[PDB]
Amino acid sequence: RHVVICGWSESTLECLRELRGSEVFVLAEDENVRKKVLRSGANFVHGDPTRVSDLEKANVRGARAVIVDLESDSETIHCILGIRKIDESVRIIAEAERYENIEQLRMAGADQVISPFVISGRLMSRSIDDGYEAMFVQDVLAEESTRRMVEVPIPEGSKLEGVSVLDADIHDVTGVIIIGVGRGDELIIDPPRDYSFRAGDIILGIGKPEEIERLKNYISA
Amino acid sequence: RHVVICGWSESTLECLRELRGSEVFVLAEDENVRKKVLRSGANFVHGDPTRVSDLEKANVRGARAVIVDLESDSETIHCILGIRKIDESVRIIAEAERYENIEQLRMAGADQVISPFVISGRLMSRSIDDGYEAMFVQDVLAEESTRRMVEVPIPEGSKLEGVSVLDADIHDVTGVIIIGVGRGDELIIDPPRDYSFRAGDIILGIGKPEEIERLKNYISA
């Protein structure tokens, strides 16, 4: 139960924020960050996120998870090869750049890629006539709104346990847009109204925090 | 009716793809790209996307729109200052990095920012326990799926014209998740079931292309 980011980013300052769990460790070369990382509670460790020795000094060993935010795409792969050389077990999340790599990135031992490159390229390609698309993404995702995505754990013998998505009627009862259901690590985006909820599932929906609360209550034991 | 990107990116190769309109012009310093841009039909112009002279040689004048994909964040601002020095009229879309800048970026003359930085940082912060969130984004957005976002123009005196969102019941009829409505450049994410559709509105929803077709047909004149 401890988290490790390795590599600095203009979105670590942000990463580091809503990430205040038991322990957060940061590995970077650029000593310049020293002040910033600490000035946010979390822990700084100075070194090369590709050197094995260093990842170990970064307590990669046993980590709740490890996040790899690096300039180069090859650097990422290396780091990962070095990461699981220590832990065939830790969760790996990596931010990626090229598409051609994503696969390789994963084969290398990565669990989640992210490719915000590929994201932007399309958004803009798509946002020629109107940024309506962009706006949404800009809001739920770029944080410009309070409307956010959520995940909501269906708890042991909830009221919604054993209930069709039609019957559930989450949006009309609560006002959050149900968009997909997680179960045992496969998201079934846009689930059919004949899908029973199984206690242990995870509702991925989108909305505001009343809306989300209301959800939480509705699907409570 | 002509589009101009200025600046190269691993997501221009992708940008350039689904962007094959009347004319696409690309401005960059790195001559290395020459072959690639052309090997995709579009037009290459060699120069500095901050030099006024150059943007003009890049036909920034009169553009259907201009997309600014640049390494530095200051470079972007400059470019934009230089862009509208030629056209207080063109559409500006810019990919951004820092949050602190977004505002300034816009004040500078930008219409849509994009900040895929800030996006990733959160995703991963959020995708510690499960990438369920990430998966979705990875799919509709990172292009890993065929489930995509859409915009759908409500046409003159459609069947849905003058009809409540409740009554519409888009998802149950067509199977696409209605998530927000564009009208005169303000997206009303998650619209209330008491919202009448006004012919000229734009449905922002998410799904597969049958689903989308079906939508198109349903809201046809």
Swiss-Prot record, chains A, B:
Recorded topology in the membrane: Multi-pass membrane protein
Residues engaged in binding Ca(2+): D69, E95, E97
Domain of life, source organism: Archaea
Record-annotated disulphide pairs: none
Start and end residues of each RCK C-terminal domain: 137-221
Effect of D69N: At high calcium concentration, mean open time is short and mean closed time is long compared with wild-type
Keyword Magnesium: no
One example of a Gene Ontology biological process annotation: potassium ion transport
Localisation: Cell membrane
Gene Ontology CC annotation, any one: plasma membrane
Gene Ontology MF annotations: identical protein binding; metal ion binding; monoatomic cation transmembrane transporter activity
Domain RCK N-terminal residue range list: 1-115
Note: It is not known whether calcium is the physiological ligand.
Main function: Calcium-gated potassium channel.
Assembly with partners or alone: Homotetramer.
Name the record gives this protein: Calcium-gated potassium channel MthK
Positions spanned in the full protein: 116 to 336 of 336
